[PDB]
Amino acid sequence: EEVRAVLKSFLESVIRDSVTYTEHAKRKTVTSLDVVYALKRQG
DNA sequence: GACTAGGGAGTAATCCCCTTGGCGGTTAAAACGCGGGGGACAGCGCGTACGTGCGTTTAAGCGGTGCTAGAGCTGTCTACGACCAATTGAGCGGCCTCGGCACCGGGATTCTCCAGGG
Incomplete structure (x- = not known):
C-alpha cells in the first residue's frame, strides 16, 4: 500500500x-523528446 | 618710451586634526570539573506475521490483421518587431524630521519540585 x-x-x-x-x-x-524533456527536470 | 602700482599665484610657514603602534583596566563569554542521575542498551520470550512449498486458474506476450485520424513538410502572405531620437515625466540622489522600535521595570500569571501524609 505504501509503494502504491x-x-x-x-x-x-x-x-x-x-x-x-x-x-x-x-x-x-506524446513524443519521446517531449516526455523526456518534461521528465528530466526531476533532478 | 621708462618706470609704477596692485593682486592672485608661487613659495612657504602654521595649524592642527588624524591616526600608527604599545599597554593597562574591566566586564563577558568561554573553559573546566563534580554528584548524580536518567538514557542506552544487553538478555530474553514470544507470537504471529510473514517466508516458503504446492494446487488452480486469468492474463501479457504471443502471432497476426485491417485499416484511420493525427503528425511532418510543401508554399505563401502579412501582421508585426527591431532598426533612429524629442521628449518629459517616473523616479532616483541627498537631507530632516518625530514616531515605532529597543528594551527594561512592577505585577499578574503561570510552570515546575518536594516531602510528606492521604
Whole structure:
C-alpha cells in the first residue's frame, strides 16, 4: 500500500509534466523528446 | 618710451586634526570539573506475521490483421518587431524630521519540585 501511495505521488507528476509539454506542443500525441524533456527536470 | 602700482599665484610657514603602534583596566563569554542521575542498551520470550512449498486458474506476450485520424513538410502572405531620437515625466540622489522600535521595570500569571501524609 505504501509503494502504491508513492507511485501515486510520483507518476502523476511525471505524467503531468508531459501533459504540460503536450499543452506547449500543440500536439495531441506524446513524443519521446517531449516526455523526456518534461521528465528530466526531476533532478 | 621708462618706470609704477596692485593682486592672485608661487613659495612657504602654521595649524592642527588624524591616526600608527604599545599597554593597562574591566566586564563577558568561554573553559573546566563534580554528584548524580536518567538514557542506552544487553538478555530474553514470544507470537504471529510473514517466508516458503504446492494446487488452480486469468492474463501479457504471443502471432497476426485491417485499416484511420493525427503528425511532418510543401508554399505563401502579412501582421508585426527591431532598426533612429524629442521628449518629459517616473523616479532616483541627498537631507530632516518625530514616531515605532529597543528594551527594561512592577505585577499578574503561570510552570515546575518536594516531602510528606492521604
